[PDB]
A paper describes a structure:
In Xenopus eggs, [name] replaces sperm protamines with core histones upon fertilization, thereby promoting nucleosome assembly on sperm DNA Laskey et al., 1978; Philpott et al., 1991; Ohsumi and Katagiri, 1991. The acidic tracts in the C-terminal tail of [name] binds H2A-H2B, histone octamers, and the linker histone H5 Platonova et al., 2011; Ramos et al., 2010; Taneva et al., 2009, while poly-glutamylation and hyperphosphorylation of [name] promote its substrate sequestration ; Lorton et al., 2023.
The major structural differences between the two forms are found at C-terminal and N-terminal segments of [name] core and at the A1 loop. In the open form, however, the C-terminal portion of β8 is bent outward to the rim. Along with this β8 bending, C-terminal segment, N-terminal segment, and A1 loop are also positioned outward in the open form. The bending is critical in forming the open-form [name] structures and increases the accessibility of the H1-binding sites. Supporting this idea, the acidic tract A1 (aa 36–40) and A2 (aa 120–140), which are both implicated in the recognition of basic substrates such as core histones Dutta et al., 2001; Platonova et al., 2011, respectively interact with and are adjacent to the putative H1.8 density. In addition, the [name] surface that is in direct contact with the putative H1.8 density is accessible in the open form while it is internalized in the closed form. Structure variation analyses suggest that [name] subunits can exhibit two structural configurations, open and closed forms, of which H1.8 is stably associated with only the open form. As the A2 and A3 belong to the disordered C-terminal tail that extends from the petal side of the [name] complex, our data suggest that the open form provides a stable association platform by exposing the acidic surface at the petal side for the substrate recognition, while the C-terminal A2 and A3 at the flexible tail may facilitate recruitment and possibly also entrapment of the substrate.
Numbering used by the authors:
A (entry chain A), B (entry chain E), C (entry chain D), D (entry chain B), E (entry chain C): 12 to 122
Amino acid sequence: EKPVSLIWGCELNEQNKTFEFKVEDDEEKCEHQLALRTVCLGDKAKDEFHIVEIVTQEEGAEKSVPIATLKPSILPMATMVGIELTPPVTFRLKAGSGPLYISGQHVAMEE
Amino acid sequence: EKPVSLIWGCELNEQNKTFEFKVEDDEEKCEHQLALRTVCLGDKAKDEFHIVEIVTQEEGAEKSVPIATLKPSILPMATMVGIELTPPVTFRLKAGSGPLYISGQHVAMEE
Amino acid sequence: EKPVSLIWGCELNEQNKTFEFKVEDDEEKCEHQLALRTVCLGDKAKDEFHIVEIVTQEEGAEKSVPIATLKPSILPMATMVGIELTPPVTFRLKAGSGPLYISGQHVAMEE
Amino acid sequence: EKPVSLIWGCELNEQNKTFEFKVEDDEEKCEHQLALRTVCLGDKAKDEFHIVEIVTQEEGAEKSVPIATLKPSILPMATMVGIELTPPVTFRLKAGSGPLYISGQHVAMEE
Amino acid sequence: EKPVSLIWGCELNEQNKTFEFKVEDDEEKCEHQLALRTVCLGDKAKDEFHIVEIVTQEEGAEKSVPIATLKPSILPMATMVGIELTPPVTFRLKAGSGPLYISGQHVAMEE
């Protein structure tokens, strides 16, 4: 169980409104985290309040976990600090259409 | 007394200007916190300085505890960092009408 | 000497350009602090760079201690982090006219 | 192996879209870091979302590591906090044309 | 060698483009620091990207050490965190004309 700070980036767009921060099955048993850093914008981003949420469970119920909200007219960027995500965790777009570049650091363990 | 980091979100709008971050009575005896993260906006938000306050007591007097202030024209979002709220705690809107999406992390203990 | 985290708010306006964060004389002997959090705006705030300063002494000389600066046209809010004020400490408005809502946390000791 | 906090600055422009934060070969064996601080803009900066990325490897694949994004119309500056870069590391401009002044602190060891 | 947290402020303007954070000769032998906090603006500030740099030496060469950059049109204020300056250290204005109010905390030792 040795550390690697493998940086990570993903895209939430119209045809990728839902995405998964995922670790392979043989590696899920180890301590894996995601230090979330920053979100940028693409060309097709709608000029409205794009909202990025975390999707996990609620004791058997569906849940959206608010993470970020932006709009290129006044807020092209948002600063979220202090979130460590343990895979698997779903990214979802509550509002807007994307694309949004979500960048963080996959802290992974490898044998 | 085991930890759960149950994420949480609430809505402060015209008919919900006052809301309560509350833990059930059988669970109040344990160490419960609320890591406050972020606030977003809804459709009916008035374009003025919405102000979100904490309501607790003042040695027998009513109190508003300033937490956030925003306005979608120039400040659609506000970044509040370092606030842990122990339930029960009231959310109140000092100015504006809402809606405002208040998101944080209910750190709860369960037996 | 037991702690209380008594939250606090004050108003710096035209007729209250100078204000005092003060602890009663029987309680000055204890460790008292002020975790400064946030500043909001009132109705009569002039649309120019309001500046909030701390007033203490300079080995026998008067001093203004820069703390915050804002203007509702582009900066309705300012984020000051890391300031603990030991009472008595004066709030002064170097520029502008107010009103400004200064909110923080009086960490007080009581017997 | 003694520390020096040698401050550092570089320019990413049209003819310098790729740059290298590099330490000399005789000094690579020591613990070298780069506390990244701030990015400013030049005269020829295009008024669009300039994006600065880190270039390293992906287990044999090319990678861009999102670091900053700005645009002088609304975001002339970006605040990136918490990044320590161990040389050699490539700076690349994913979008835009520059120039961009990237400033940080080369924490270097010398014999 | 006893501590004093003597707060400090200085002005970088057209006729004061260069300034010195200095400690008296009889006191230079002690551990002296400057926790840099904040920069505000004056009346004669040009509406362009004012840049504040630190001036020290480069193994016999002149150096400018980027610290802050602002412009009252979109960035009337800049938030620089984590800089402790040991006197003597020169403040210089790389771009712009000032005035700029630089405020921090001279952590000084006195016998």
